[PDB]
């Protein structure tokens, strides 16, 4: 009994953490694209603030 | 007091007629605000008048490791 569940324990463990590695890198590209759209507004706000 | 009032309006229009700019300032107001803005632009930032900024960024290299199980 204890070695039958030892089969099934590693097949629910592995598919959870192999999609966490999908989504831990998925957030790494959104927060570097959201900060790409935001920064290009910041360095054109400096010229909208300087000449006044 | 209206006759005193239009006497003020006369001297504002002779102050409008300018050809050399600051007549009473001289070098005192010219050396001040040129040094005042450059002391403030040093606190503001080194940005050009028409150079639009453009750049790129490098994301982290998503590496992997090994772990022998089953």
UniProtKB/Swiss-Prot annotation, chain B:
Record PTM Phosphoserine, positions in chain: 70
Major location (coarse): mitochondrion
Entry keywords, A to Z: Acetylation, CF(0), Hydrogen ion transport, Ion transport, Membrane, Mitochondrion, Mitochondrion inner membrane, Phosphoprotein, Transport
Entry-annotated residues carrying N6-acetyllysine: 3, 8, 41, 46, 61, 67
Subunit structure: Component of the ATP synthase complex composed at least of ATP5F1A/subunit alpha, ATP5F1B/subunit beta, ATP5MC1/subunit c (homooctomer), MT-ATP6/subunit a, MT-ATP8/subunit 8, ATP5ME/subunit e, ATP5MF/subunit f, ATP5MG/subunit g, ATP5MK/subunit k, ATP5MJ/subunit j, ATP5F1C/subunit gamma, ATP5F1D/subunit delta, ATP5F1E/subunit epsilon, ATP5PF/subunit F6, ATP5PB/subunit b, ATP5PD/subunit d, ATP5PO/subunit OSCP.
A molecular function GO annotation: proton transmembrane transporter activity
Phosphoprotein among keywords: yes
Protein name: ATP synthase peripheral stalk subunit F6, mitochondrial
Primary gene name: ATP5PF
N6-succinyllysine PTM positions: 46, 61
Pfam families to which the protein is assigned, alphabetical: ATP-synt_F6
Localization (cell): Mitochondrion; Mitochondrion inner membrane
